[PDB]
A paper describes a structure:
Old Yellow Enzymes (OYEs, EC 1.6.99.1) are a class of flavin-dependent ene-reductases (ERs) catalyzing the asymmetric hydrogenation of electronically activated C=C bonds in the presence of nicotinamide cofactors. We have identified and produced four new putative ERs from the filamentous fungi Aspergillus niger CBS 513.88 and Botryotinia fuckeliana B05.10. Based on the most recent classification, AnOYE2 and BfOYE1 belong to Class II OYEs, as they share all the fingerprint motifs described for “classical” OYE homologues identified in fungi. On the other hand, AnOYE8 and BfOYE4 share most of the typical conserved residues reported in Class III OYEs (S23, P24, C26, A60, Q102, R215, S249, Q265, G284, M285, F305, G307, R308, and R312; YqjM numbering).
AnOYE8 was solved and refined in the C121 space group with four molecules per asymmetric unit. The overall structure of a single subunit showed the typical conserved α8/β8-TIM barrel fold. In agreement with the general behavior of Class III OYEs, the four molecules within the asymmetric unit assembled into dimers with the functional quaternary architecture peculiar of these enzymes. AnOYE8 is an elongated dimer composed of two protomers with an interacting surface of 2807 Å2 (data obtained by EMBL-EBI-PISA analysis). Both the α1-helix and loop 3 (capping subdomain), as well as the peculiar long N-terminal and C-terminal loops of each protomer, were involved in the dimerization surface, which contained 71 interfacing residues that established 18 hydrogen bonds and 8 salt bridges. The C-terminus of each subunit (from Gly393 to Lys416) protruded through an “amino acid finger” (Trp397) that reached the active site of the adjacent subunit, shaping the entrance and the catalytic cavity of each subunit. AnOYE8 accommodated a non-covalently bound FMN cofactor molecule lying at the bottom of the active site pocket. Similar to other Class III OYEs, AnOYE8 contained the highly conserved proton donor Tyr220 and the histidine pair (His215 and His218) involved in the binding and proper orientation of the substrate through hydrogen bonding with the electron-withdrawing group of the substrate. The omit electronic density map revealed the presence of a small organic molecule, most likely SO4 anion, present within the crystallization precipitant agents, lying on top of the isoalloxazine ring of FMN. In the complex with SO4, two oxygens of the compound formed two hydrogen bonds with the side chain of His215 and Tyr220, thus confirming the importance of these residues in substrate orientation and catalysis.
Residue numbers in the entry:
A (entry chain C): 2 to 401, 405 to 416, 422
B (entry chain B): 3 to 276, 282 to 401, 405 to 417
The structure:
């Protein structure tokens, strides 16, 4: 009668509200069929996710001095528009020299909050949840952007690199094309920990709903863990007991600065894909042990189980759900003390729901699949015959009345 | 020791895209010949990298004709995936010509920077984006399509103008639709004047082309449709009497735009009332190939009259354009739109039926990677932005192996 087009609430600008957020499955379900676990909500701390299909964090090598531009709104905003359970922002440097590339996002200054907040604000206008993977590239810092012919090389001070400011647990390079790391002094660690706390606060200011700690891909914290990159003879190296000291502090510190209401995640690498060797390697057993130590600690809410990037001589056997067995191995070890999410060439909805139902995991992350298909939530929903919400701008053409839910039978691939 | 170059001509930094997305490989690795779909088209001096384009789609997400951060996230991602051309939704030349109070507008000058920020991004990517200027005529002051009061009038309460609705006559669309006032000749004058001004600010926004909305029962269409255009004036009566305002706006648009700016015209080819029909359409279409002001005709259908009975279907309105192409030949280019959900149907529509451009609407809403998807349908290698293709590589080619990440 006089139904009005209501504005999304809390946003510096107008856009139509979405009353059911996109990616929310129909709870009654016209089919009468039950909603599969992939499209079942998850409440972690004071935060609920309409589904369990997340966008894994993905560096776009498109910021300037760590500042997001319009680009990232067009990038992330189109994906947030189509209803992913959660969006993770790319590795965001805590210190300038912890950037991977010179084009990385960073959050070591307050000028980098607004660029990110503008995107987090678009996600929020659509009713989505969005967060930030805090990172430090350790001995893999000051490299080249990876679509460049110079890819896999050192970023010189002429490209904006810092070849003489790469820091890590010890002074051993990752590769021969990679830079020479400088053993981090206690002054270094101290400031890194201060810088992590500083960056997390700016993230909450930007409007992140959760924080993920990047302790993976041989970047740092991960390098502290792997014995062959950390030959320190102090309390931060030596035993496995010691090599975890710093990761466990950052976990504690992140939880401290966000409080009790903000989910905290941790990404780790489960194996270094190093073939039979008699020396100490980062194998699944090590990962599960670290994961166990984290559940003892109580800080983290979820472990994000990736692999690789740890050692230059890896031999990763990529394939569909190839690193799903790692995350299973971790959930059997921690059970319901922590949640785990998996990632890695998860390409259809069946595999996704199965890794959550049969194999008993909590959250499925996709990366490349969203880059090629920003509507994967709709695609996966179609794989499992699930009716899911899509925003009004997008659904009304794929209709027949006034439900916020799309029939999985329409525009079937 | 290479450098990552910024894009050119843009406010902000963004990695530059040497080979635009949607650009096939001139020497296709497979040796297979580039299908027409992925063959470039040049209108005036403008060159499109493929014949797959984003059809104009309204988003009912604007405030005072102003675009927001939404349209950047909406068209942005779609554009990043290399659509040959991207058309901005119907931009109203007059406030009362808006379909809804949430339509994008170009009747003032504060409505340019909004529309230009998105064009700027498209340009940063190497893509060609244009704008469809329009007037809703008797179908204006209506509600958004996803709202329960869909197919109804927007009162001043919602921000509508149920009284300032101006069309070719007081003939309303339906009991649900608003009551329109027949426009005075001074009204038509003001309208034509508004169009020129709107096109002018569009060129200031960065438009690479302009499409005329002469379809869907809006003013220009309402004038060509006898059941709504009976003014007894030089505009009312003879088919020629009704074709004037349309043909005038065509020339006027060609006049305001230069000779290097392509100008398209979208028309409805039937009212599905079987009365405007493929015949009336082919006639008006030839009148356009005569005037020589329009470079491309966007053949569509529907919206002309309530009580219409559209028969939707894969390529349901392709025949309409094949007929227009028949009576126009190389005199004008023709574009088809309508449930084209795969590349094979699209390419065929181009090669086996001679048509020039394939336009997709909803396919892009569901899949802003449609071009990538149509590419795999025809085993075509296309460029994708360096930010997207690097992970899908086994390494320096801007093109993606259509075999990687296939359904
Ligand atoms: C382009 C690109 C950027 C990425 N950026 C990050 C990142 O910033 N932080 C991180 O932990 N992983 C990053 N990843 C790793 C992926 O997020 C994730 O582990 C996933 O495996 C990548 O591909 P997938 O869809 O097959 O799972 C990135 C991957 C790609 C392809
Ligand atoms: C959400 C939406 C918005 C649209 N906006 C416009 C428009 O602004 N101008 C126009 O001429 N047609 C518009 N259309 C019609 C389409 O652009 C076009 O006629 C056709 O539907 C696209 O073909 P396809 O959707 O079957 O791929 C719109 C259609 C939809 C679903």
């Amino acid at each position: 009668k006089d139904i009005k087009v209501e504005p999304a609430k809390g946003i510096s600008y107008f856009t139509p509200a979405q009353e059911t957020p996109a990616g929310t499955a129909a709870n009654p379900q016209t089919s009468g069929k039950a909603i599969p676990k992939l499209f079942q909500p998850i409440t972690i701390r004071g935060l609920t996710f309409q589904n369990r299909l997340g966008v894994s964090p993905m560096c776009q090598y498109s910021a300037e001095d760590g500042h997001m531009t319009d680009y990232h709104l067009a990038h992330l905003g189109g994906i947030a528009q189509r209803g992913p359970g959660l969006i993770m922002i790319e590795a965001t440097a805590v210190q300038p020299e912890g950037r991977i590339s010179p084009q990385d996002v960073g959050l070591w200054k307050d000028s980098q909050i607004a660029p990110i907040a503008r995107v987090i604000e678009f996600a929020h206008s659509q009713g989505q949840k969005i967060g930030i993977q805090l990172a430090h590239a350790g001995r893999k810092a000051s490299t080249t952007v990876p679509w460049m012919l110079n890819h896999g090389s050192i970023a010189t001070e002429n490209v904006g690199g810092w070849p003489d400011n790469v820091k890590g647990p010890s002074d051993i390079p990752f590769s021969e094309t990679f830079p020479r790391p400088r053993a981090m002094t206690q002054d270094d660690i101290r400031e890194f920990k201060e810088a992590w706390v500083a960056a997390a606060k700016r993230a909450l200011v930007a409007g992140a709903d959760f924080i993920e700690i990047h302790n993976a891909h041989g970047y740092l914290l991960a390098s502290f863990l792997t014995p062959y990159a950390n030959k320190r003879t102090d309390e931060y190296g030596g035993s496995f007991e010691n090599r975890m000291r710093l990761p466990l502090k950052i976990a504690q510190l992140t939880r401290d600065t966000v409080g009790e209401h903000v989910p905290v995640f941790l990404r780790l690498s489960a194996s270094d894909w190093l073939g039979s060797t008699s020396t100490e390697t980062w194998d699944l057993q090590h990962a599960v042990r670290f994961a166990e130590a984290l559940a003892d600690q109580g800080a983290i809410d979820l472990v994000d189980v990736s692999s690789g990037g740890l050692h230059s001589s890896q031999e990763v056997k990529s394939g569909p759900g190839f690193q799903a067995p790692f995350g299973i191995a971790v959930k059997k070890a921690v059970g319901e003390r922590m949640l785990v999410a998996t990632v890695g060439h998860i390409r259809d909805g069946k595999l996704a729901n199965r890794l959550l139902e049969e194999e008993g995991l909590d959250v499925v992350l996709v990366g490349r699949g969203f880059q090629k298909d920003p509507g994967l939530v709709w695609t996966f929903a179609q794989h499992l015959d699930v009716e899911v919400a899509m925003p009004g701008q997008i659904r009304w053409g794929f209709s027949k009345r006034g439900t916020p839910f799309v029939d999985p039978s329409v525009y079937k691939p």
